[PDB]
Amino acid sequence: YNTIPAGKDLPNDIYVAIEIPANASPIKYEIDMDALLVDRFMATPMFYPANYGYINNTLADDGDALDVLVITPYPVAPGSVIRARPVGVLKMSDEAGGDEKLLAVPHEKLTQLYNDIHDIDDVPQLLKDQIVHFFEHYKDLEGKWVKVEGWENADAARAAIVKSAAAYKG
Amino acid sequence: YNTIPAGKDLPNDIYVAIEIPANASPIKYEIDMDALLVDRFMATPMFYPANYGYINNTLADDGDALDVLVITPYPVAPGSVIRARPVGVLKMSDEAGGDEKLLAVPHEKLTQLYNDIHDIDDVPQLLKDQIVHFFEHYKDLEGKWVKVEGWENADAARAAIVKSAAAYKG
Amino acid sequence: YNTIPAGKDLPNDIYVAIEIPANASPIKYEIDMDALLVDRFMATPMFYPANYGYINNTLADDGDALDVLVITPYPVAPGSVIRARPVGVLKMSDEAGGDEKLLAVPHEKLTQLYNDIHDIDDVPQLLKDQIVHFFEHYKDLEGKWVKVEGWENADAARAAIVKSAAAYKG
Amino acid sequence: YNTIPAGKDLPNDIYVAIEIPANASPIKYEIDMDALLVDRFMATPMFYPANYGYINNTLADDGDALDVLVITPYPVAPGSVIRARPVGVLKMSDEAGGDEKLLAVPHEKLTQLYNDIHDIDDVPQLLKDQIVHFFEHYKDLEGKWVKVEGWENADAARAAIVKSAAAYKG
Amino acid sequence: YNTIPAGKDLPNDIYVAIEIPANASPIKYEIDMDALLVDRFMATPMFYPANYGYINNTLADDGDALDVLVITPYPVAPGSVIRARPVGVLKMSDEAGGDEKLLAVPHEKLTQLYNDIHDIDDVPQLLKDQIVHFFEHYKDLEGKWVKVEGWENADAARAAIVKSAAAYKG
Amino acid sequence: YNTIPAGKDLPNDIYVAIEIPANASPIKYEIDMDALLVDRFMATPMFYPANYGYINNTLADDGDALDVLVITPYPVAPGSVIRARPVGVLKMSDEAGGDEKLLAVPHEKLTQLYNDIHDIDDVPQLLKDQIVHFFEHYKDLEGKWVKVEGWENADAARAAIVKSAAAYKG
Ligand code: NA
Ligand code: NA
Ligand code: NA
Ligand code: NA
Ligand code: NA
Ligand code: NA
Ligand code: NA
Ligand code: NA
Ligand code: NA
Ligand code: NA
Ligand code: NA
Ligand code: NA
């Protein structure tokens, strides 16, 4: 997992290592040890609206790799890697400070399904609202809290990827 | 579905017709027509912490049959019937007025797993907290709202079953 | 199953009794006997791109009830009923003569997901192409064959529902 | 469920109403009330090697309808009906006396997969051994016990169907 | 898999690499090659009552790493790692000599669900009885046999972890 | 994944690294990076009739490792390895030239289920016909095409493994 590239051509052509599939049981996996760890069994009765993972060889303003949600037509396996392109970013804050969750779709080479989704406005509204709801509430029953600020666009997402890839010094 | 009895011996020995399994996809089934209808695809990214259905031949102070959640070791099929016994009731309110969701376990004849669960205090705390969280939030993305008041005990649940069975005049 | 209405307000507000879920194992259920029968285990290694069923109290120009595919965000259970609205119809022929498979989305009351899908052009192209492919090929390994003609619009679908409801004399 | 025929042409062409799918979670459904009931959550950590149900309008020497296991390439839904043909019968005894579990395959009209399975010798040995093991052990953790005697052939199965259909007086 | 630590703080704070999820299909995975191998398709129609794996960098009195079952609210993926704490150990014998299967729960950091389970008496009786039944019978249809002796407590489990970690010389 | 052996004893005793399980969702995984990548979401509404992967340290006349389908009683996880033995090979062509898909069963040590399957004639006809159908059609909705030639026997499969293992120079 340490050796997966951030992307073929940052910031628009990235690899996301998926930790948690969309619509899965409430097991919060995290890739550590070179291993898929169980970080927690999520306490709230919720599921991730899209697959959740990160871009390797990035360092977010919060100390871990940059987080990314990837929309797919079928949930992918934990630990699998998906070639993707960013379409937006959700800004938030928690008990540990600021955070952002990018939103991405699979690269055109993987599927024609998202050929008309190029920026955050193109993503179905209900899915965005569900991602917001999830991040507002998923920690409600964990000493952990979350405040969600709002969406920014694909340029802002690409900016996050550039910043975080530059910050990585490993 | 019209012809399923409320129970072998109300209020402590009931039948619950299950509409929605625990931990299922967000399809909100309702038994109508003598049919399992799709009432809605739930908008919020949540799941029912326990199986959800109702007692036939009851009329809740809200116009439909009395609602009951049934804890089981494995989610049951929509449309199946489970012989159960009440252990508590969760009181709430919504856009249509007052409401209550009973909590029950399968009858002893079905499983020895719940032999030590006789009242609401005996139910695992996290499961209660998850049921509360679910009812507080499940309608967040639907013109529909919900305020949750709190738990009452097995006697209060049995009282709800008596009241609702008396109210049924069909 | 005999007693489910064709719809609240034909032709635009219908009920579809689902026989086969989208993306399911290759069991071709049919509602008979008032029962969910197994008609066949499908020989070809394919799945239905959308839920498949029929409108009760209709008689298609082919002798059985009018067939309808219903797009949903999650596959529904066999034997469940979904309130739906037509968006198009796929015309074809087989070893028994002409046939048509309507395409529908859930009624607005069930979900906001399809508020912008009002006619066949609004349906994602790949999904249409997959439905075509499925009907072209699903009988390839069964003495049964199928020739697919092409899509017609929501008005043509509504016309099929009117014709078939009129033809029903039961 | 009361109104499903025993078969198109007994004893070789039967209908089996399935209660429990092959390879399913340990929920022991039974068709009652015209309803799919949960009879028990099975205590032993086992699964049915083949779908399990019964032939309607039969009365086994044990007081309930004749029991039948149906081999299929994919587990079927509880409550569905499968047109089948008998290939053997497993004789046993329990806390309530003698019992027999027929073994059947889907009718040729449903699948070509079993065209070479006409009697008990033709059934894969491991599957037979697993069905034996299951019936020997499934009640180990329930005041209920079971002794398994052995297989008899398709003629003996057909004989069981004739006897049980004659015994039904409802 | 070779490089996963035995634990943060043996013997009470361990890592278990899971090979087989609870309630899964009968595929007996084993971690080898640095790979998840299929060791066998289990012949008996049974499932593991809890997730099954081992502690890395241990050597059991039987030649392979120390075996551990981990109770979780949802089955975890094969190949994932769970931080756990021992609560008991099941002693047995087979065709190759003595053996022991530890029982553990996830560490408090992963879930509050097991805060009241500190020793073997606190584990639900039926689950213990099912684990016993499984180990008594899972090899019934494999030239392989098993005799189960009985449970010992959390101190005995911790003793097994100490012994086995000391024995590892790799 | 780079370090998994081709086999214990080529050509009859091989290891297949599985990329795509039988009967799975249409995610076309490929093992790359030492990683399970998503190569594509398959456009056609089809599934693999048997698990699909490759033999490591082989080079097919087409530039990648030799492809193998492995029949199992339960689909295995992507990324798992199965010890297998060849029973036949399906010859074909595509947009990139000639290709072959071996067919194999698990080694006897893993299961007794295939003890009577030693060559291609012994494999169930419908399964062969489904594998043919799948390879004829799976690329129908992808600028990619496929022409299927026909089956050859277990000796021809073993010949393919010898040729491809010799060709590997890594
Ligand atoms: Na972050
Ligand atoms: Na919190
Ligand atoms: Na209510
Ligand atoms: Na609302
Ligand atoms: Na038709
Ligand atoms: Na045909
Ligand atoms: Na019987
Ligand atoms: Na017993
Ligand atoms: Na051991
Ligand atoms: Na044995
Ligand atoms: Na190839
Ligand atoms: Na093509």
PDB file of N, CA, C and O in Angstrom, chain E residues 34-65:
ATOM      1  N   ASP E  34       3.095 -14.734   1.324  1.00  0.00           N
ATOM      2  CA  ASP E  34       2.470 -13.426   1.623  1.00  0.00           C
ATOM      3  C   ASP E  34       1.096 -13.359   0.937  1.00  0.00           C
ATOM      4  O   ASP E  34       0.802 -12.340   0.277  1.00  0.00           O
ATOM      5  N   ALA E  35       0.300 -14.425   1.043  1.00  0.00           N
ATOM      6  CA  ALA E  35      -0.908 -14.514   0.272  1.00  0.00           C
ATOM      7  C   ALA E  35      -2.045 -15.189   1.007  1.00  0.00           C
ATOM      8  O   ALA E  35      -1.834 -16.039   1.863  1.00  0.00           O
ATOM      9  N   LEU E  36      -3.250 -14.784   0.635  1.00  0.00           N
ATOM     10  CA  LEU E  36      -4.459 -15.428   1.113  1.00  0.00           C
ATOM     11  C   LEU E  36      -4.728 -16.615   0.197  1.00  0.00           C
ATOM     12  O   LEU E  36      -5.185 -16.431  -0.939  1.00  0.00           O
ATOM     13  N   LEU E  37      -4.485 -17.807   0.723  1.00  0.00           N
ATOM     14  CA  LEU E  37      -4.651 -19.048  -0.013  1.00  0.00           C
ATOM     15  C   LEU E  37      -6.022 -19.625   0.314  1.00  0.00           C
ATOM     16  O   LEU E  37      -6.584 -19.331   1.377  1.00  0.00           O
ATOM     17  N   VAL E  38      -6.573 -20.435  -0.588  1.00  0.00           N
ATOM     18  CA  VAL E  38      -7.711 -21.297  -0.256  1.00  0.00           C
ATOM     19  C   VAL E  38      -7.123 -22.632   0.233  1.00  0.00           C
ATOM     20  O   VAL E  38      -6.537 -23.397  -0.567  1.00  0.00           O
ATOM     21  N   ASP E  39      -7.265 -22.932   1.521  1.00  0.00           N
ATOM     22  CA  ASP E  39      -6.708 -24.201   2.030  1.00  0.00           C
ATOM     23  C   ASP E  39      -7.615 -25.364   1.680  1.00  0.00           C
ATOM     24  O   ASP E  39      -7.152 -26.443   1.301  1.00  0.00           O
ATOM     25  N   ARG E  40      -8.920 -25.116   1.857  1.00  0.00           N
ATOM     26  CA  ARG E  40      -9.925 -26.063   1.416  1.00  0.00           C
ATOM     27  C   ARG E  40     -11.306 -25.454   1.288  1.00  0.00           C
ATOM     28  O   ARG E  40     -11.589 -24.378   1.851  1.00  0.00           O
ATOM     29  N   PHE E  41     -12.148 -26.112   0.522  1.00  0.00           N
ATOM     30  CA  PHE E  41     -13.581 -25.858   0.629  1.00  0.00           C
ATOM     31  C   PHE E  41     -14.081 -26.845   1.690  1.00  0.00           C
ATOM     32  O   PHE E  41     -13.962 -28.067   1.531  1.00  0.00           O
ATOM     33  N   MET E  42     -14.542 -26.318   2.832  1.00  0.00           N
ATOM     34  CA  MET E  42     -14.963 -27.183   3.945  1.00  0.00           C
ATOM     35  C   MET E  42     -16.122 -28.099   3.515  1.00  0.00           C
ATOM     36  O   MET E  42     -17.103 -27.640   2.915  1.00  0.00           O
ATOM     37  N   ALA E  43     -15.976 -29.401   3.784  1.00  0.00           N
ATOM     38  CA  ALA E  43     -16.933 -30.437   3.370  1.00  0.00           C
ATOM     39  C   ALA E  43     -18.223 -30.441   4.185  1.00  0.00           C
ATOM     40  O   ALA E  43     -19.291 -30.796   3.672  1.00  0.00           O
ATOM     41  N   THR E  44     -18.127 -30.078   5.454  1.00  0.00           N
ATOM     42  CA  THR E  44     -19.331 -30.152   6.306  1.00  0.00           C
ATOM     43  C   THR E  44     -20.140 -28.845   6.132  1.00  0.00           C
ATOM     44  O   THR E  44     -19.529 -27.782   5.897  1.00  0.00           O
ATOM     45  N   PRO E  45     -21.485 -28.917   6.226  1.00  0.00           N
ATOM     46  CA  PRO E  45     -22.320 -27.734   5.971  1.00  0.00           C
ATOM     47  C   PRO E  45     -22.427 -26.854   7.226  1.00  0.00           C
ATOM     48  O   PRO E  45     -23.505 -26.770   7.864  1.00  0.00           O
ATOM     49  N   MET E  46     -21.304 -26.194   7.535  1.00  0.00           N
ATOM     50  CA  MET E  46     -21.162 -25.415   8.770  1.00  0.00           C
ATOM     51  C   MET E  46     -20.547 -24.062   8.487  1.00  0.00           C
ATOM     52  O   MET E  46     -20.050 -23.829   7.371  1.00  0.00           O
ATOM     53  N   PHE E  47     -20.640 -23.159   9.458  1.00  0.00           N
ATOM     54  CA  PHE E  47     -19.936 -21.850   9.347  1.00  0.00           C
ATOM     55  C   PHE E  47     -19.246 -21.512  10.673  1.00  0.00           C
ATOM     56  O   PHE E  47     -19.627 -22.017  11.732  1.00  0.00           O
ATOM     57  N   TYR E  48     -18.210 -20.659  10.611  1.00  0.00           N
ATOM     58  CA  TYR E  48     -17.510 -20.249  11.850  1.00  0.00           C
ATOM     59  C   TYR E  48     -18.392 -19.277  12.639  1.00  0.00           C
ATOM     60  O   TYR E  48     -18.867 -18.269  12.089  1.00  0.00           O
ATOM     61  N   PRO E  49     -18.660 -19.578  13.931  1.00  0.00           N
ATOM     62  CA  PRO E  49     -19.515 -18.662  14.702  1.00  0.00           C
ATOM     63  C   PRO E  49     -18.894 -17.283  14.956  1.00  0.00           C
ATOM     64  O   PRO E  49     -19.617 -16.338  15.300  1.00  0.00           O
ATOM     65  N   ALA E  50     -17.563 -17.185  14.838  1.00  0.00           N
ATOM     66  CA  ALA E  50     -16.871 -15.891  15.027  1.00  0.00           C
ATOM     67  C   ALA E  50     -15.747 -15.851  14.021  1.00  0.00           C
ATOM     68  O   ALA E  50     -15.405 -16.885  13.440  1.00  0.00           O
ATOM     69  N   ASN E  51     -15.223 -14.647  13.763  1.00  0.00           N
ATOM     70  CA  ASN E  51     -14.094 -14.548  12.807  1.00  0.00           C
ATOM     71  C   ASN E  51     -12.912 -15.376  13.283  1.00  0.00           C
ATOM     72  O   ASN E  51     -12.646 -15.411  14.449  1.00  0.00           O
ATOM     73  N   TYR E  52     -12.176 -15.951  12.330  1.00  0.00           N
ATOM     74  CA  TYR E  52     -11.089 -16.889  12.695  1.00  0.00           C
ATOM     75  C   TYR E  52      -9.777 -16.448  12.060  1.00  0.00           C
ATOM     76  O   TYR E  52      -9.731 -16.113  10.892  1.00  0.00           O
ATOM     77  N   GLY E  53      -8.736 -16.394  12.873  1.00  0.00           N
ATOM     78  CA  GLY E  53      -7.389 -16.051  12.366  1.00  0.00           C
ATOM     79  C   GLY E  53      -6.324 -16.407  13.378  1.00  0.00           C
ATOM     80  O   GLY E  53      -6.451 -17.386  14.111  1.00  0.00           O
ATOM     81  N   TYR E  54      -5.264 -15.609  13.374  1.00  0.00           N
ATOM     82  CA  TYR E  54      -4.106 -15.962  14.182  1.00  0.00           C
ATOM     83  C   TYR E  54      -3.337 -14.713  14.583  1.00  0.00           C
ATOM     84  O   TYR E  54      -3.522 -13.634  14.021  1.00  0.00           O
ATOM     85  N   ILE E  55      -2.454 -14.895  15.569  1.00  0.00           N
ATOM     86  CA  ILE E  55      -1.555 -13.819  15.990  1.00  0.00           C
ATOM     87  C   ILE E  55      -0.194 -14.043  15.300  1.00  0.00           C
ATOM     88  O   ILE E  55       0.412 -15.104  15.428  1.00  0.00           O
ATOM     89  N   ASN E  56       0.270 -13.045  14.557  1.00  0.00           N
ATOM     90  CA  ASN E  56       1.540 -13.202  13.858  1.00  0.00           C
ATOM     91  C   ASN E  56       2.692 -13.245  14.869  1.00  0.00           C
ATOM     92  O   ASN E  56       2.550 -12.748  15.995  1.00  0.00           O
ATOM     93  N   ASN E  57       3.821 -13.831  14.474  1.00  0.00           N
ATOM     94  CA  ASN E  57       4.978 -13.910  15.364  1.00  0.00           C
ATOM     95  C   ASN E  57       4.680 -14.654  16.663  1.00  0.00           C
ATOM     96  O   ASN E  57       5.191 -14.318  17.759  1.00  0.00           O
ATOM     97  N   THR E  58       3.879 -15.693  16.520  1.00  0.00           N
ATOM     98  CA  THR E  58       3.683 -16.663  17.578  1.00  0.00           C
ATOM     99  C   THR E  58       3.863 -18.058  17.010  1.00  0.00           C
ATOM    100  O   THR E  58       3.712 -18.292  15.806  1.00  0.00           O
ATOM    101  N   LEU E  59       4.222 -18.990  17.884  1.00  0.00           N
ATOM    102  CA  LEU E  59       4.338 -20.366  17.477  1.00  0.00           C
ATOM    103  C   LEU E  59       3.656 -21.224  18.543  1.00  0.00           C
ATOM    104  O   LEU E  59       4.141 -21.328  19.702  1.00  0.00           O
ATOM    105  N   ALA E  60       2.527 -21.812  18.140  1.00  0.00           N
ATOM    106  CA  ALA E  60       1.714 -22.634  19.011  1.00  0.00           C
ATOM    107  C   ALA E  60       2.413 -23.971  19.208  1.00  0.00           C
ATOM    108  O   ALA E  60       3.249 -24.380  18.373  1.00  0.00           O
ATOM    109  N   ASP E  61       2.064 -24.660  20.297  1.00  0.00           N
ATOM    110  CA  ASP E  61       2.692 -25.952  20.602  1.00  0.00           C
ATOM    111  C   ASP E  61       2.488 -26.943  19.433  1.00  0.00           C
ATOM    112  O   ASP E  61       3.091 -28.025  19.424  1.00  0.00           O
ATOM    113  N   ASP E  62       1.684 -26.535  18.434  1.00  0.00           N
ATOM    114  CA  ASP E  62       1.374 -27.336  17.226  1.00  0.00           C
ATOM    115  C   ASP E  62       2.074 -26.970  15.896  1.00  0.00           C
ATOM    116  O   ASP E  62       1.718 -27.529  14.838  1.00  0.00           O
ATOM    117  N   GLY E  63       3.026 -26.032  15.917  1.00  0.00           N
ATOM    118  CA  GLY E  63       3.819 -25.704  14.716  1.00  0.00           C
ATOM    119  C   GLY E  63       3.432 -24.501  13.852  1.00  0.00           C
ATOM    120  O   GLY E  63       4.239 -24.019  13.044  1.00  0.00           O
ATOM    121  N   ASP E  64       2.199 -24.019  13.997  1.00  0.00           N
ATOM    122  CA  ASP E  64       1.753 -22.819  13.275  1.00  0.00           C
ATOM    123  C   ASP E  64       1.454 -21.720  14.293  1.00  0.00           C
ATOM    124  O   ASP E  64       1.530 -21.954  15.500  1.00  0.00           O
ATOM    125  N   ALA E  65       1.117 -20.527  13.813  1.00  0.00           N
ATOM    126  CA  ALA E  65       0.814 -19.427  14.728  1.00  0.00           C
ATOM    127  C   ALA E  65      -0.382 -19.769  15.617  1.00  0.00           C
ATOM    128  O   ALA E  65      -1.230 -20.621  15.262  1.00  0.00           O
TER     129      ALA E  65
END
